[PDB]
């Protein structure tokens, strides 16, 4: 009878909640009270990349910290070179719509995905041809939200069907399928070790999926609205997540709780992307209010503000070196803040 299953599930949930509550005997704000402020962080729009004829929806750097992909609804995927701000590749996409991108670490591939439910993988380094459709992965049933490169061969993807997948490019098959989300997976994030990866959702929950084993390890909740972005901590033991409630939350894996919440009364619009600095002391969150806020990591005290766009800040990224911070907005202009 469904009644007994529901009752034991509720009992287990209450047990988990009580355990977590017992774990949280203090507060991160209290432990970080003695820590001093970081200070105002002034940033100027050093370089501005223009050429996209429509709003930008996603971007991603490379291990070189130099090249950076971008996506636009016009149907053209650009590969900018931040140093000289001179386009190095412009790929015309089959589908006019695109909702994500990915630049593999080795730099020998690029990805793309949108409403067409067909994760395309284009080859960049070729003998004579400029760019060719290396592969097209079509197993999902909904729009893709984000794609990341585990390696030149494997690629993990999240779709609107509430199911993540781990495709093998060479074979073109769903080597593994993670399911369990009750809503759309709007964004995911790989860890530095690449063994585990976190996945947001629209049902106000995040799940820590294990790549090799293929099982959910932990679940984190606490948001009052959908999760529109997520990003690990550079250390790899905790992860920050935005939401539509204008509230960012820094969850921890080991403790299995919410360490701290960044939120201010002034800001009312939702978040669209988040990221961490190299040392992780500053959480950069690109709000939907045409601005970007650099919150302190350990003090939840805002520090500086980046406002150079007219429309909402869509995508935000930072280089592994941590030297620059790219921000792409619907203004059709990427800004390499520094």
């Amino acid at each position: 009878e469904l009644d007994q299953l529901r009752q034991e599930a509720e009992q287990l949930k209450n047990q988990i909640r009580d355990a977590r509550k017992a774990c949280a005997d203090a507060t991160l704000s209290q432990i970080t009270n003695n820590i001093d402020p970081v200070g105002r962080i002034q940033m100027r729009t050093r370089r501005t990349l223009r050429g996209h004829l429509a709003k930008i929806y996603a971007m991603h750097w490379g291990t070189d910290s130099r090249l950076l992909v971008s996506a636009s609804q016009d149907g053209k995927l650009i590969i900018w070179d931040s140093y000289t701000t001179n386009k190095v590749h412009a790929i015309p996409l089959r589908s006019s719509w695109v909702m994500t991108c990915a630049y593999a670490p080795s730099g020998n591939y690029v990805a793309c995905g949108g409403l067409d439910n067909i994760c395309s993988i284009y080859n960049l380094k070729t003998r004579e041809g400029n760019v060719r459709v290396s592969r097209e992965l079509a197993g999902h049933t909904g729009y893709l939200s984000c794609c990341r490169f585990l390696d030149d061969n494997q690629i993990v993807t999240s779709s609107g069907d509430t199911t993540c997948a781990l495709w093998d490019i060479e074979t073109g098959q769903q080597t593994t399928t993670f399911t369990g989300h009750t809503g759309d997976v709007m964004s995911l994030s790989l860890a530095p070790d690449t063994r585990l990866f976190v996945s947001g959702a629209c049902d106000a929950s995040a799940k820590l999926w294990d790549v090799r084993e293929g099982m959910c390890r932990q679940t984190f909740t606490g948001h009052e609205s959908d999760i529109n972005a997520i990003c690990f901590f550079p250390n790899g033991n905790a992860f920050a997540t935005g939401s539509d409630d204008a509230t960012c939350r820094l969850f921890d894996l080991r403790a299995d709780q919410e360490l701290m919440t960044y939120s201010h009364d002034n800001i009312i619009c939702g978040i669209t992307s988040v990221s961490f600095s190299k040392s992780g002391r500053l959480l950069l969150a690109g709000y939907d209010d045409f601005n970007c806020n650099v919150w302190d990591a350990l003090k939840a005290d805002r520090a500086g503000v980046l406002a150079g766009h007219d429309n909402r800040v869509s995508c935000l990224g930072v280089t592994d070196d941590g030297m620059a911070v790219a921000t792409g907005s619907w203004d059709s202009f990427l800004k390499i803040w520094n």
């Binding site: 469904l2 299953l5 529901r6 034991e8 599930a9 287990l12 949930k13 047990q15 988990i16 355990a19 977590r20 774990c23 949280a24 005997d25 203090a26 507060t27 991160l28 432990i31 970080t32 820590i35 970081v38 962080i41 050093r46 370089r47 931040s82 140093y83 000289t84 369990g180 099982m215 959910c216 390890r217 932990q218 679940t219 901590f233 550079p234 250390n235 033991n237 905790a238 921890d252 080991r254 403790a255 299995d256 709780q257 360490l259 600095s277 190299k278 040392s279 992780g280 002391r281 500053l282 990591a297 350990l298 070196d321 941590g322 030297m323 620059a324 911070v325 390499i336 520094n338």
Partner: protein
Amino acid sequence: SIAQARKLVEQLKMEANIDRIKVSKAAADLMAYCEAHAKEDPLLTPVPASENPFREKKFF
């Protein structure tokens, strides 16, 4: 429905059995790490103008 509830209860039972450390330990670890790797961060501490690639640096 039946399979859904069974999978749900199995996942919850597997999740409840995990070692959790007090928030104090995790907070202290994150603090120590963010303290150790603060010098290398470019955004936090002003990076030398010469080393700053975007402003003025020799490219090739």
